[PDB]
Amino acid sequence: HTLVWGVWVNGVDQGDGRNIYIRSPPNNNPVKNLTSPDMTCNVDNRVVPKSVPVNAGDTLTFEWYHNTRDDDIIASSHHGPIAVYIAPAASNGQGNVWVKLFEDAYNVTNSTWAVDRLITAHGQHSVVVPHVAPGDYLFRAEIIALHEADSLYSQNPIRGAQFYISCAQITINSSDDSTPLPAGVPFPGAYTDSTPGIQFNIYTTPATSYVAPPPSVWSGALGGSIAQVGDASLE
Ligand SMILES: *[C@@H]1O[C@H](CO)[C@@H](O)[C@H](O)[C@H]1NC(C)=O
Ligand SMILES: [Cu+2]
Secondary structure (H helix, E strand, C coil): CCEEEEEEECCEECCCCECCCECCCCCCCCECCCCCCHHHHCCCCCCCCCCEEECCCCEEEEEEECCCCCCCCCCCCCCCCEEEEEEEHHHCCCCCCEEEEEEECEECCCCEEHHHHHHHCCCEEEEECCCCCCEEEEEEEEEEECCCCCCCCCCCCCCCCEEEEEEEEEEECCCCCCCCCCCCECCCCCCCCCCCCCCCCCCCCCHHHCCCCCCCCCCCCCCCEECCCCCHHHC
């Protein structure tokens, strides 16, 4: 159970983004229904009044929290991967538009899931803004908690993979559009019950065997990292 507070750009806090430049749902409940429109940008997908200005090569940092800013972030039980996608704002996230900028599942060296490292990073994970066409965009940050993913939601609706999905309105101003955005996947639609990484038993399968859901990260991406860039407690 986790939500996005706001973003940082190049290590600078852009301020509380909730219902402002983040298309915030009303609470931190997970999405589980792979076929639901809620898979696109969570349960209250509507235009919010601000869009954060960035330039290609900027570091865009999502900041997550559980109940209050810079708390325990997400329950330690919620082991799983983290991905970031991008689509043009004109789509409203509909169609084959979502391009993967970032993937992190399991780190064999540190023996830690993306979520484990997200807690250590005080909820902060980043992408580098790509050299796409100037204009308005949706950045879709997705945490998959796998603690009940031995079941499929489609089969047992009280279990299944849990999706914490947040869409940020981002305006890319300065960009040479040298890496124009290629074709995207649909949400809902990219993830199905047979998709690798959707049904997984983190209690019996080695984390080293985990494969995260496709698609693969775009070659045009520059992203990106799970790591604290700023200290919220200094404000
Ligand atoms: C899952 O979402 C689909 C598509 O909106 C919907 O038809 C179906 O009833 C949902 N399942 C549940 C259990 O609500
Ligand atoms: Cu939860």
